[PDB]
A paper describes a structure:
The ligand-binding site involves both the N and C-terminal parts of the TLR3 ectodomain.
The closest contact area between the dimeric TLR3 units is composed of the negatively charged N-terminal and the positively charged C-terminal residues of the neighboring ectoTLR3 dimers. To test their role in TLR3 clustering, we made two charge-reversion mutations. The N-terminal mutant, NT-mut had a triple mutation of K117D, K139D and K145D and the C-terminal mutant, CT-mut had a triple mutation of D523K, D524K and E527K of ectoTLR3. The micrographs of the resulting complexes show that the clustering of ectoTLR3 is significantly reduced or entirely blocked by the mutations.
Numbering used by the authors:
A (entry chain B), B (entry chain A): 29 to 687
Write the structure that this text describes.
Amino acid sequence: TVSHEVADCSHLKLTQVPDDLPTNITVLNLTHNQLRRLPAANFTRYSQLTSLDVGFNTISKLEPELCQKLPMLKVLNLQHNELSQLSDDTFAFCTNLTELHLMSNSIQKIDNNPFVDQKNLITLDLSHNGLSSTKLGTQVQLENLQELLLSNNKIQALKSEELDIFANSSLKKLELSSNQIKEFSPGCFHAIGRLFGLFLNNVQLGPSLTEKLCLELANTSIRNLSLSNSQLSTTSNTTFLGLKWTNLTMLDLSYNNLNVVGNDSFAWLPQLEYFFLEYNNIQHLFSHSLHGLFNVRYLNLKRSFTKQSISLASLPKIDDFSFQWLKCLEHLNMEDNDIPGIKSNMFTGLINLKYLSLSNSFTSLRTLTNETFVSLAHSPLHILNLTKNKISKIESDAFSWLGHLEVLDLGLNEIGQELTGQEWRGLENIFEIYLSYNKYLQLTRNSFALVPSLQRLMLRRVALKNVDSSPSPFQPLRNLTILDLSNNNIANINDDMLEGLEKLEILDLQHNNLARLWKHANPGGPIYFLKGLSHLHILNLESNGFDEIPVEVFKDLFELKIIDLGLNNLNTLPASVFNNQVSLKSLNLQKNLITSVEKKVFGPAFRNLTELDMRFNPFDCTCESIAWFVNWINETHTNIPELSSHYLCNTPPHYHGFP
Amino acid sequence: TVSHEVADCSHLKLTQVPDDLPTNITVLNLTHNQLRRLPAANFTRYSQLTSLDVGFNTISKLEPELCQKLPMLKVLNLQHNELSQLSDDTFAFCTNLTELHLMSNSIQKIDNNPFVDQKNLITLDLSHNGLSSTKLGTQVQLENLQELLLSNNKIQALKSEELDIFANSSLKKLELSSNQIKEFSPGCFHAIGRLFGLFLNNVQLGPSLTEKLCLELANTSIRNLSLSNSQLSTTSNTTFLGLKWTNLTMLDLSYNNLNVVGNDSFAWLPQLEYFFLEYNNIQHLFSHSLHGLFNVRYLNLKRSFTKQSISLASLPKIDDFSFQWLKCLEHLNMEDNDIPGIKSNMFTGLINLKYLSLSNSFTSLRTLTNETFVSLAHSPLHILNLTKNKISKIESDAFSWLGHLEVLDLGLNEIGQELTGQEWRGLENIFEIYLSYNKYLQLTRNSFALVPSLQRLMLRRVALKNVDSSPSPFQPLRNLTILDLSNNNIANINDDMLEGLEKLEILDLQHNNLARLWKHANPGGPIYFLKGLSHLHILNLESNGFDEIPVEVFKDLFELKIIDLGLNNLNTLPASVFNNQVSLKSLNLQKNLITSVEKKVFGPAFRNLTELDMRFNPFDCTCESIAWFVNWINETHTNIPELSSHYLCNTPPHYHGFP
RNA sequence: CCCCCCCCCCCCCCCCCCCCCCCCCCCCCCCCCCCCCCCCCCCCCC
């Protein structure tokens, strides 16, 4: 029962409220308890409460005296309780309350007038209850109420008189989800003075009931409308006609199993701004299917189309000119589809597009020809995602039509080819290119020579070839910042590989084979491939097979902060290597063969750090090899994990395993 | 120039013979020298020589005085020299010689009588010379000569008078290989009193010349005849008619490119005993093709048939009943063929067969049905080799017709199935079964229950499955001796796996995964799967991932001699484990993580050995961990390899790498 | 001036074997989360 400023009593299995807490407590949490009853006589001590979070209990009934002991209470949380009876005196004396949760309270019926006398409520919750009608009063009250929740109830009708108690209130959210509503009375929503947002998730409406609902929703100020999982199989040109007279902006059609969309279906929403079609079953989209949507600014189409079936091969076809009417479209999420491929004229008309995500959108986009993105010629694209598309090859001038492209994501593909360098033609302002997890790439001396402005390059588990060319392919990228070359089994790197990239900061080189490149027995001497990068910050060199350290590799990283040498084969290290790393922060040397750590090699490294990772090391417990290290450990401030569990010696056997 | 009893001077680049050797030397070797001449005046000291091996020199001429200094000389070796002139006085005074090599001596012509006066020669060599005729005398001499070599010469004729100088000699071997002989004079071999063996390798005879030769070889005592690489494309029923009148037993037809054999071709050799057809190009063998061979006891057919060609698919077909006439056949080597498969009645009639090798004999013998070996019903087979036949499956009762089979070799196949146990039915006296290098085998509780007499089982890199069954499959083999279970990645073994096999001696278990089976943290305790084998001798347990040693596994191997624990992960070992191994001979503990070896654990192991393998061990140089070991090394007799190269410590750094 | 016979030394190519490092895939576990189901005990409501 820890309590300093807020009080929490979750998972303590209380029976009665504690009598020993600070008087000035503002937050009181008593979830996951067994309070059969809540007498108010124990609330005399607590006279400064603001929040009362006592859900997940078995409280039978409440008394008005509790309102006397809490005159400044703000939140009354009563989820999952047995308050099956409500009266006027139940919430009478409480008038300063602004929150009221009655979720899963098994309330049967509202009798006369339980909430009339108080007016400071902003949100009312009545979810998972046994209510059959929305009758919560007779006269008008709850002027300040804006959100009403009535989901998961047993309501089957919405009569006009029922909402008459909100004749002068502004409704931001009217939650009526999962209630088997089968009819709508005329004028029921016109009884609401100001209706802004409406929710009917998991409500079995269907086509005709949606027609009648839209006819009812006419001449109101609605902006939000969610009809998710309403089993709306088909829409037509008159489905949302009643929404012509309003100014709706956000509309949801997720999980509705929408098989087909009629022509000019959404012509009655000129003011729509957001529109959601995730997880549908569309088989064919027509040309004028999205007509009248010249103001949509955000469209989601994740898994909106039918998956391929071997019985019929019902591949979802998208006709040409289909997105012409989305003049102000600014975002298109188009993931997890089974579209056979891109046509020549699909995305014409998007004059203000800024985002297109195509992650796993196509079953077989084998080749990226130079005519694939011609429909994106005038669209000012900035981010393109081409992940998990099973793309096999990229031809010349594939992205030449993307003039203002800045981010390209080609991860998790099946690209096996040689980068001739003509792919990035026309990318005059490109910044990032992602190419991780491909089949194989064989770079060329001028692979990235066509894009000076590139700053990022992700090449993890891509299995590069000919990276050891005499001219360095990464040299022309005169402003590169992040480079990842992990999981590639790279064996040879040249000394002139990375000069001129003065702003390079992050270099990840884990799980490779550079053991030969650093041992002095290598012909021509060890390769010094980390020279010239003045502003490098993050370096990852774990699992390389390194057995020796050339003394002048880290001599130019004047601002290095994060270095990683785990999973290596290092046993002894030459002294005076980390001298110029004046501000090293994170050193990771786990799962190595290190047997002796001492000052003249790791002193400047241990100058001012923040994290050390030296978990699985066979240390030798000897004053020549461990004494200075344990001296450094004894007084320290570095965040070092698992020091008392895995920092165990190996030899001599007398001190085997003793920290 | 080391010389104790024999003298060797090979690869010393001598100019003249040494003058300082023991007088009683019997063997004198001076190969690979530059002796321009060999004066006899330096041979006064050497008066007890028996062998004179002075080949690979540049000796111009010899003098008869050398014979005076060596009266008991036996061997005169003069390969590759410039003795282009021979006379009667050249080998006159030498009469006790019994060996004479004149290979590659560039001898042009034999003038009058160089070898007449001496008679103790048994072998005469004249290979790689420039002789044009076999004239080596006028009268009769060389009564005791038995082998004559005349290969790689420029002889083009064999006249009858030419061999008249051997009218009363027994010729065991007449080597005339690679001489372009184009005619044969009648009576040339009848001039030889007793001709036994004849060689004509690499001689362009062809069919008709072979006919004439056989007609000439009539009425002689020949036994050996090699016609290898004679470009004999075709034979007929009368090819060897002249050999009817002799008693030939061994005949060679290797490398002759024999495309087809006529019917009843070998009907003229009732006394043949050995017969060689390796590396031929036979396309089709007829029924009566081997008629008249009822006495052949050893036949070689390695690569005797045509390989498959995609142009025509000329698969070599063997007709049925083809081996019926080989009544006394005792050995058939039948490797490296491209036979499509075995027919139902191929090997009938072999009443005394004892060996059939079928290594890589068939391109696609996918299934071993129960009717494959029906033709081998009455043949007393003892060894069968079925290696590299790409056999995919073995069905029930496949070897049921091999009543007296003792060895079965099924290695290097593609067998992926489950051994139901019915395969070995009828093998009432089987001893060894080899099954290494297969795809996958899944044993059954009664896989080997049908053959009590089995003694060997090779299962290397076979990837066994369900070896951890509750009843042990290897239990019924009540006399097993050798078991190999390497390269299988076996993970689980039961404690009741190998009881009752009291005579088991060799058990190889390398490159597996038994790390869990021995660590004490395993549920149920470590598995003691080596209990009961009283007479085990050879054990291989390298590369298993072992990290701990249960103390009572090697307690019953009272006669163990060879144990292997290399490539493991052992770091420290519990004491008193090798107590009962009173006669351990070979201990292999290379490439481990051992850091301390000392007496109470390895003392009884180091009692009386013969070989220790502890090459790559990270030792800890400390008197608690290395002092007793180096004490044991300092005085020893065990054959321990590479002690001064790889026995280097790891910690502390002061003694890193110092032996 | 030509053709051959060597001895010695230095390179190139191919094949085989062995060793080290690493990657990918798979197997045997062990651990931490997520979800579902079943069972036991206790406290209440209708």
